[PDB]
Structures are given as C-alpha cells and as structure tokens.
C-alpha cells in the first residue's frame, strides 16, 4: 500500500517529546490486529503497518518483555 517505508511518520495523536504511548499503542494495535486476523482466518499481512511502526519506535527490551509477558499470561494491556 505504502512501501518504501522509511521510518514511523509524525502522528498527531503523539506530538510531544514523550513518545512512550506511541510505541505502546502501536504494539497493542499490532497484536490486536493480529488476533483479529488469524482468528477470523484472514491474513496477518494487513497488520503490517503497526508492526513496522512499533518495531521502529519501541526499545528492544520493551518489546521483548511485553512478548514474554503475553506468553506468560501477565501482559496487562487488553488485546
């Protein structure tokens, strides 16, 4: 749809120096989308954008901890 993705664009929902919620929201949106797909048998490729954005913005250790906690059943966000 919009390849030649370079990095995450400006998002007016998160226009200030603290970008923590930008990373978190994209991480949630990705995983929520991926659950919504797969489930309904459709294709996880539609979730790609959220994936690219959260990978760009999020520290590796945050992603890794949140992925561990999803696997453990202790992730506190709603997916």
């Amino acid at each position: 749809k919009i390849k030649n993705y370079q990095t995450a664009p400006f998002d007016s929902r998160f226009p200030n120096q603290n970008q923590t919620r930008n990373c978190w929201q994209n991480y949630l949106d990705f995983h929520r989308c991926e659950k919504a797909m797969t489930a309904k048998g459709g294709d996880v490729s539609v979730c790609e954008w959220y994936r690219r954005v959260y990978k760009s913005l999020c520290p590796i250790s945050w992603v890794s901890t949140w992925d561990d906690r999803r696997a453990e059943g202790t992730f506190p966000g709603k997916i």
Binding site: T20, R21, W24, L28, W62, W66, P76, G77, K78
Partner: protein, 259 residues
C-alpha cells in the same frame, strides 16, 4: 517585673529531649530497616511520648494553674495552630499530587488504565461511605461540644465530646478492618502505594486528633476549661475539622473518582 503581656517560659529540658527522641526514632527506623533491630526505635518512641507528655503538661501548668495565657499569648497560640495546620495541608498536598500524577496518566506497566489491571478497588458506597458519615457526624458533635462549653454546660460538653471521640475510634477501627480485608496491598504498585500511604497518614492524624480530643475530655473532667478560655479544645476542634476535610478529599479522589 515585666509590663508586657507575653510569656517568658522557664528554661526547659523538653526541647532537647524531643530533639534527641527524633534522632532515636530516625536512627531507630534505619536500624529496623537495615540491621534487623527494633531497639533504638522503641527507645525513641518512648522518649518522644515522655517528652510530649511533660511538655504539654507544662503548658497546662503554665496556663490553667499559673495564669500566663493572657489574651495576647492566646492570640499567638491561635496563629501557631493555624500555621501548623497549613503546613499539614501542604504535606497531604504532596500525596494528592502523587496520586493524580499516576492515575491521570497511567503507564503501560499498569495496563495503560486506571485503576490498573488486576486491581479491584473497594466499593466507595460501602465502608468508605460509612467512614464518611462517621467523620462528618463527628464534626457536628464537636460543634455541639463547643457550643455547650461556651454556654457553660459541663454535662452536655462531656457527652458531645465523648460522642465525637467514639466516632473517631469507630472510624479508626473501621479503617483497620478495611486495611485487613483489602485484596490489594501497599506493594500492589502505585495504586496500593498511593492508597495506603495517603489514607495511612490520614489515619495517623485521626489517631493524633482523637488523642488530642481525649486529652481535652480529661481536662474538661478536671474543670480546666472556662466558658471563655479553652484554647486547647479550640485547637483540637480545628485539627479535627482538618482531619475531616482531608478525609473528604481522599474519599472523592482516591475511593470515588479513582475507582
């Protein structure tokens, strides 16, 4: 002989014993937290309690028994007590600030929501509403105690003051029971931290206020108060209304809005 109305106090050991009590309590908490020992802390609590008792005993000797509280001295003690209350309001403001900071912008660790994921708040319409009625009622009954005292009615002053203390004790026991029943603890992230430290310092002040009302009850039993001169009772009533207003802010903020 002086010809002003102010009180030159006799030289006193209590400021030094109070200062050392504070060194013993704080070095005592340090030894408790780090060196597994309660010894220094009980010595400091004991000496703090001895110091308070003798110092305020001496203020009653100086006033009720020796007559040094002229109107100019009483007016200073009015200002003193108001300023002390103001500093206690600012101490609670720091905890309210911490509460609103964390609840208004809940971080990802909590689930990005308030109350956090995994927290099940008390229902504010149950024992918290009861505690609210209890402290509000005790503000009415202390007001009755004050008017009875001004009207020179010893028996109804004591009846109303006893009712006020009984309600103070009821709130404290209800709170102690809610602390035991609560399914979250002080270790349950910033929700348990704000909840217990803010309501716990409030509870400490309800205990202090109630102690002060009990001191006023025994002095009234001893006839120390006159119908026009009774600043200790006024100060305890002002401190008691402060504890009630702080409760009202805690109930609306933490128990209600924060549920």
């Amino acid at each position: 002989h002086q010809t002003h109305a102010y009180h030159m106090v006799n030289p006193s050991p209590w400021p030094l014993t109070g200062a050392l009590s504070a060194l013993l309590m704080t070095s005592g908490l340090t030894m408790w937290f780090h060196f597994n020992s309660m010894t220094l802390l009980m010595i400091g609590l004991t000496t703090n309690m001895l110091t308070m008792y003798q110092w305020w005993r001496d203020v009653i000797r100086e006033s009720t028994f020796q007559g040094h509280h002229t109107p100019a001295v009483q007016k200073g003690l009015r200002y003193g007590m108001i300023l002390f209350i103001i500093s206690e309001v600012l101490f609670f403001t720091g905890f309210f600030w911490a509460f609103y900071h964390s609840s208004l912008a809940p971080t990802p660790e909590l689930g990005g929501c308030w109350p956090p994921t995994g927290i099940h708040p008390l229902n504010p319409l149950e024992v918290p509403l009861l505690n609210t009625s209890v402290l509000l009622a005790s503000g009415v009954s202390i007001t009755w105690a004050h008017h009875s005292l001004m009207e020179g009615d010893r028996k109804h002053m004591l009846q109303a003051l006893f009712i006020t203390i009984t309600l103070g004790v009821y709130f404290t026991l209800l709170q102690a029971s809610e602390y035991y029943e609560a399914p979250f603890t002080i270790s349950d992230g910033v929700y348990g931290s704000t909840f217990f430290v803010a309501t716990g310092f409030h509870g400490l002040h309800v205990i202090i206020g109630s102690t002060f009302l009990i001191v006023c009850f025994f002095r009234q039993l001893k006839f120390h108060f006159t119908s026009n001169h009774h600043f200790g009772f006024e100060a305890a009533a002002w401190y008691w209304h402060f504890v009630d207003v702080v409760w009202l802010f805690l109930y609306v903020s933490i128990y209600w809005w924060g549920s």
